[PDB]
Amino acid sequence: QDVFVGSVEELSAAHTLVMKINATDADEPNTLNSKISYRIVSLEPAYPPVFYLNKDTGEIYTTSVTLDREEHSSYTLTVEARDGNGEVTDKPVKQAQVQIRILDVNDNIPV
Amino acid sequence: AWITAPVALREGEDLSKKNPIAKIHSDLAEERGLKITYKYTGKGITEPPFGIFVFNKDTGELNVTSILDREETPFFLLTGYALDARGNNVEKPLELRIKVLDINDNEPVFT
């Protein structure tokens, strides 16, 4: 799909599951030529790395860097999907946007 | 080191051709064949408000995304850093401030 969508709470833990993505390829099935892997080519704000992408699965996890809803209430990522054994040249490929929406927690005290 | 006054930019103009508004670079790395990866920090990059700045990890450069407004903010305060592929902060930090300059784009209001 062109856009993928996910959510997560603030003040959460590492390796906490956010959402899944997928892609497909036209070489023969069960070959290194169609063996899909994933990567974050865009994030906003780009530093630090707050998310992790299992190349095993296309599952988006958190990293050890904690999100805050009082900082940002959403994050937009772009992701790129690759195969085989060669490496990235200047010629692009099709990429897809990810959208991670933040959930509040009760870290602020009624008075 | 040298205590600096900031780079100035002005409100209400396009900054496309005024970028980059900071840049880290080192030809002592070049003479040695060394590579470096960068980070920046502070306003717009790791702290609020946001929607103002972005930075390049490969090239050391810092950009401006938008048009400034001086009745939003007079100034901004950041820190750039340089680090190697084994985690080592390679040189003294880029201590770095930006100043926002003011023109008559509003008319007075009564009390």
Side-chain angles (χ1 to χ4, degrees), chain A residues 3 7 9 15 39 42 45 59 65 68-69 86 105 109:
Chain A
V3 186
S7 52
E9 199 178 273
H15 214 59
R39 78 173 190 154
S42 297
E59 288 179 270
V65 178
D68 186 10
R69 199 277 330 167
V105 313
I109 302 160

PDB file of all heavy atoms in Angstrom, chain A residues 3 7 9 15 39 42 45 59 65 68-69 86 105 109:
ATOM      1  N   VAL A   3       0.571   4.033   1.992  1.00  0.00           N
ATOM      2  CA  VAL A   3       0.692   4.546   3.343  1.00  0.00           C
ATOM      3  C   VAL A   3       0.432   3.410   4.324  1.00  0.00           C
ATOM      4  O   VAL A   3      -0.589   2.743   4.283  1.00  0.00           O
ATOM      5  CB  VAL A   3      -0.167   5.775   3.605  1.00  0.00           C
ATOM      6  CG1 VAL A   3       0.025   6.437   4.970  1.00  0.00           C
ATOM      7  CG2 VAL A   3      -0.019   6.853   2.529  1.00  0.00           C
ATOM      8  N   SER A   7       0.301   3.060  15.903  1.00  0.00           N
ATOM      9  CA  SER A   7       0.260   3.787  17.158  1.00  0.00           C
ATOM     10  C   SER A   7       0.985   3.116  18.312  1.00  0.00           C
ATOM     11  O   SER A   7       1.228   1.912  18.333  1.00  0.00           O
ATOM     12  CB  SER A   7      -1.160   4.225  17.506  1.00  0.00           C
ATOM     13  OG  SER A   7      -2.056   3.141  17.442  1.00  0.00           O
ATOM     14  N   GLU A   9       1.873   4.134  22.825  1.00  0.00           N
ATOM     15  CA  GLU A   9       1.928   4.933  24.037  1.00  0.00           C
ATOM     16  C   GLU A   9       3.323   5.462  24.343  1.00  0.00           C
ATOM     17  O   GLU A   9       4.335   4.844  24.018  1.00  0.00           O
ATOM     18  CB  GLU A   9       1.215   4.044  25.053  1.00  0.00           C
ATOM     19  CG  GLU A   9       0.750   4.866  26.253  1.00  0.00           C
ATOM     20  CD  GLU A   9       0.004   3.941  27.205  1.00  0.00           C
ATOM     21  OE1 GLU A   9      -1.227   3.711  27.099  1.00  0.00           O
ATOM     22  OE2 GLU A   9       0.717   3.202  27.916  1.00  0.00           O
ATOM     23  N   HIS A  15      11.589  -2.495  22.320  1.00  0.00           N
ATOM     24  CA  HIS A  15      11.156  -3.673  21.585  1.00  0.00           C
ATOM     25  C   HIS A  15       9.683  -4.024  21.704  1.00  0.00           C
ATOM     26  O   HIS A  15       9.279  -5.188  21.745  1.00  0.00           O
ATOM     27  CB  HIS A  15      12.075  -4.864  21.816  1.00  0.00           C
ATOM     28  CG  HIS A  15      12.294  -5.811  20.657  1.00  0.00           C
ATOM     29  ND1 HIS A  15      12.823  -5.451  19.420  1.00  0.00           N
ATOM     30  CD2 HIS A  15      12.028  -7.151  20.638  1.00  0.00           C
ATOM     31  CE1 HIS A  15      12.833  -6.531  18.634  1.00  0.00           C
ATOM     32  NE2 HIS A  15      12.492  -7.579  19.406  1.00  0.00           N
ATOM     33  N   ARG A  39      14.121  -1.102   5.804  1.00  0.00           N
ATOM     34  CA  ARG A  39      14.961  -0.045   6.345  1.00  0.00           C
ATOM     35  C   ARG A  39      14.283   1.310   6.440  1.00  0.00           C
ATOM     36  O   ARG A  39      13.397   1.583   5.626  1.00  0.00           O
ATOM     37  CB  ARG A  39      16.333   0.030   5.679  1.00  0.00           C
ATOM     38  CG  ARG A  39      16.505   0.673   4.307  1.00  0.00           C
ATOM     39  CD  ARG A  39      17.963   0.812   3.880  1.00  0.00           C
ATOM     40  NE  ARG A  39      18.020   1.636   2.674  1.00  0.00           N
ATOM     41  CZ  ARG A  39      19.053   2.385   2.275  1.00  0.00           C
ATOM     42  NH1 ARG A  39      20.199   2.406   2.958  1.00  0.00           N
ATOM     43  NH2 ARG A  39      18.871   3.013   1.102  1.00  0.00           N
ATOM     44  N   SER A  42      13.671   7.629   6.138  1.00  0.00           N
ATOM     45  CA  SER A  42      13.265   8.937   6.603  1.00  0.00           C
ATOM     46  C   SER A  42      12.624   8.746   7.968  1.00  0.00           C
ATOM     47  O   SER A  42      11.870   7.786   8.164  1.00  0.00           O
ATOM     48  CB  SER A  42      12.247   9.575   5.651  1.00  0.00           C
ATOM     49  OG  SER A  42      12.735   9.823   4.354  1.00  0.00           O
ATOM     50  N   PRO A  45      11.280  14.092  13.873  1.00  0.00           N
ATOM     51  CA  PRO A  45      12.688  14.408  13.751  1.00  0.00           C
ATOM     52  C   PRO A  45      13.678  13.261  13.694  1.00  0.00           C
ATOM     53  O   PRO A  45      13.598  12.271  14.411  1.00  0.00           O
ATOM     54  CB  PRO A  45      12.965  15.213  15.023  1.00  0.00           C
ATOM     55  CG  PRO A  45      11.887  14.856  16.057  1.00  0.00           C
ATOM     56  CD  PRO A  45      10.719  14.613  15.107  1.00  0.00           C
ATOM     57  N   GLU A  59       8.141  -6.036  11.023  1.00  0.00           N
ATOM     58  CA  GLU A  59       7.586  -5.445  12.230  1.00  0.00           C
ATOM     59  C   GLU A  59       8.405  -4.253  12.705  1.00  0.00           C
ATOM     60  O   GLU A  59       9.605  -4.386  12.868  1.00  0.00           O
ATOM     61  CB  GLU A  59       7.466  -6.500  13.322  1.00  0.00           C
ATOM     62  CG  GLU A  59       6.336  -7.461  12.964  1.00  0.00           C
ATOM     63  CD  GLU A  59       6.168  -8.557  14.003  1.00  0.00           C
ATOM     64  OE1 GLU A  59       6.794  -9.631  13.907  1.00  0.00           O
ATOM     65  OE2 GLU A  59       5.319  -8.505  14.921  1.00  0.00           O
ATOM     66  N   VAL A  65      15.144   4.431  23.163  1.00  0.00           N
ATOM     67  CA  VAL A  65      14.979   5.875  23.281  1.00  0.00           C
ATOM     68  C   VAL A  65      13.498   6.140  23.492  1.00  0.00           C
ATOM     69  O   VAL A  65      12.674   5.726  22.679  1.00  0.00           O
ATOM     70  CB  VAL A  65      15.525   6.573  22.045  1.00  0.00           C
ATOM     71  CG1 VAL A  65      15.344   8.090  22.090  1.00  0.00           C
ATOM     72  CG2 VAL A  65      17.003   6.232  21.845  1.00  0.00           C
ATOM     73  N   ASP A  68       7.774  10.594  24.101  1.00  0.00           N
ATOM     74  CA  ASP A  68       7.054  11.595  24.864  1.00  0.00           C
ATOM     75  C   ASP A  68       5.963  12.200  23.990  1.00  0.00           C
ATOM     76  O   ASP A  68       6.254  12.658  22.884  1.00  0.00           O
ATOM     77  CB  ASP A  68       8.140  12.563  25.343  1.00  0.00           C
ATOM     78  CG  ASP A  68       7.744  13.681  26.291  1.00  0.00           C
ATOM     79  OD1 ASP A  68       6.609  13.678  26.807  1.00  0.00           O
ATOM     80  OD2 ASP A  68       8.621  14.559  26.473  1.00  0.00           O
ATOM     81  N   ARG A  69       4.736  12.217  24.513  1.00  0.00           N
ATOM     82  CA  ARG A  69       3.643  12.840  23.805  1.00  0.00           C
ATOM     83  C   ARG A  69       3.720  14.351  24.008  1.00  0.00           C
ATOM     84  O   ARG A  69       3.371  15.133  23.127  1.00  0.00           O
ATOM     85  CB  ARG A  69       2.333  12.316  24.381  1.00  0.00           C
ATOM     86  CG  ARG A  69       1.171  12.558  23.421  1.00  0.00           C
ATOM     87  CD  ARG A  69       0.401  13.874  23.298  1.00  0.00           C
ATOM     88  NE  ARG A  69       0.331  14.662  24.527  1.00  0.00           N
ATOM     89  CZ  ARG A  69      -0.040  15.924  24.803  1.00  0.00           C
ATOM     90  NH1 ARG A  69      -0.439  16.790  23.861  1.00  0.00           N
ATOM     91  NH2 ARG A  69       0.103  16.424  26.037  1.00  0.00           N
ATOM     92  N   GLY A  86      23.881  -7.298  -3.870  1.00  0.00           N
ATOM     93  CA  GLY A  86      24.438  -6.006  -4.220  1.00  0.00           C
ATOM     94  C   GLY A  86      23.981  -4.927  -3.251  1.00  0.00           C
ATOM     95  O   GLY A  86      23.188  -5.203  -2.352  1.00  0.00           O
ATOM     96  N   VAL A 105      -0.045   9.085  28.422  1.00  0.00           N
ATOM     97  CA  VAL A 105      -0.258   8.443  29.705  1.00  0.00           C
ATOM     98  C   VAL A 105      -0.360   9.527  30.774  1.00  0.00           C
ATOM     99  O   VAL A 105      -0.020  10.684  30.562  1.00  0.00           O
ATOM    100  CB  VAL A 105       0.816   7.431  30.099  1.00  0.00           C
ATOM    101  CG1 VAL A 105       1.121   6.489  28.940  1.00  0.00           C
ATOM    102  CG2 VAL A 105       2.070   8.037  30.718  1.00  0.00           C
ATOM    103  N   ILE A 109      -0.320  15.706  36.908  1.00  0.00           N
ATOM    104  CA  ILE A 109      -0.939  15.548  38.213  1.00  0.00           C
ATOM    105  C   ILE A 109      -2.088  16.547  38.279  1.00  0.00           C
ATOM    106  O   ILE A 109      -1.895  17.707  37.917  1.00  0.00           O
ATOM    107  CB  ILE A 109       0.089  15.807  39.311  1.00  0.00           C
ATOM    108  CG1 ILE A 109       1.291  14.875  39.182  1.00  0.00           C
ATOM    109  CG2 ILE A 109      -0.542  15.833  40.695  1.00  0.00           C
ATOM    110  CD1 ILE A 109       2.549  15.360  39.893  1.00  0.00           C
TER     111      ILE A 109
END
